[PDB]
From a paper:
The IsPETase structure belongs to the α/β hydrolase superfamily, and the central twisted β-sheet is formed by nine mixed β-strands (β1–β9) and surrounded by seven α-helices (α1–α7). At the active site of IsPETase, three residues Ser160, His237, and Asp206 form a catalytic triad and Ser160 is postulated to function as a covalent nucleophile to the carbonyl carbon atom in the scissile ester bond, as in other carboxylesterases. Based on the scissile ester bond of 2-HE(MHET)4, the substrate binding site can be divided into two subsites, subsite I and subsite II, where one and three MHET moieties are bound, respectively.
The structure reported here comprises residues Ser31-Gln292 visible in the electron density map. The asymmetric unit in the P212121 space group contains one molecule of IsPETase, indicating that IsPETase exists as a monomer. The size-exclusion chromatography experiment also confirms that IsPETase functions as a monomer. The substrate binding site is simulated to form a long, shallow L-shaped cleft on a flat surface with dimensions of approximately 25 and 29 Å. For binding of the first MHET moiety in the subsite I, the benzene ring is positioned on a ravine between the two aromatic residues of Tyr87 and Trp185. Compared with TfCut2, IsPETase has an extended loop in the region with three extra-residues (Asn244, Ser245, and Asn246). The disulfide bond is also conserved in IsPETase and formed between Cys273 and Cys289.
Author numbering: 30 to 292
Write the structure that this text describes.
Amino acid sequence: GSHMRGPNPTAASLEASAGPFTVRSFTVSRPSGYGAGTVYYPTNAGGTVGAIAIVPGYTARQSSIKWWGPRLASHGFVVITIDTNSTLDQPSSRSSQQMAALRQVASLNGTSSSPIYGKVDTARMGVMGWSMGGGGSLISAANNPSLKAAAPQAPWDSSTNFSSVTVPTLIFACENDSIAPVNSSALPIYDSMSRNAKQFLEINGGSHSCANSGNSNQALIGKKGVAWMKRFMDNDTRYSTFACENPNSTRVSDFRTANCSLE
């Protein structure tokens, strides 16, 4: 059951600012169950693609996470970046809104007036987000185990117990994070997950914003995020190595992975 799109990847192709497909985007006119949204999609993926919903952190807006939209969509995904109903929404609410974004994407897929009519395989979805939006993505994965992948960054949640998560999860962590410190947040969350494919990628010297728009590690972090989503959302074993490998980067201070085969 693979859903391969695009050419055989290389490190270089995954490190570049964009994948092979042309991207277009639109603002959602009437958001349903969240505050606002921007949808990024490939015009020419050569078949239906999965959908990924991305949520910012507390006080933050789409600009924090917007670089993922084009970056992922150009590799063959429909990506929705959201603003929350309130910038002060907590993780459980962020999860609900993330799922609501995914639901609206599915709605749009079935709406013959929409730019993404027929472009989405609604059975294949993923979740991403920053800080509380990363905690929200973990909650989404716990509550919705049919999700195919999760890749939060600098996650924050008042609980670190995500032991029920069976969804393939990549945790981007930021070594010097003072907001959601790795030793009390990201790493205990990673360690908590005992039943899934998982990965822990800590960015050397990174502040809590180390995986946000404008970061200085977009080559590495974009390669890993796209590779993880391709491997797991698409069941694309062309990406096993890129998804599961230690990336051998002096930009990485800590790398861990489990249940993640290279080949």
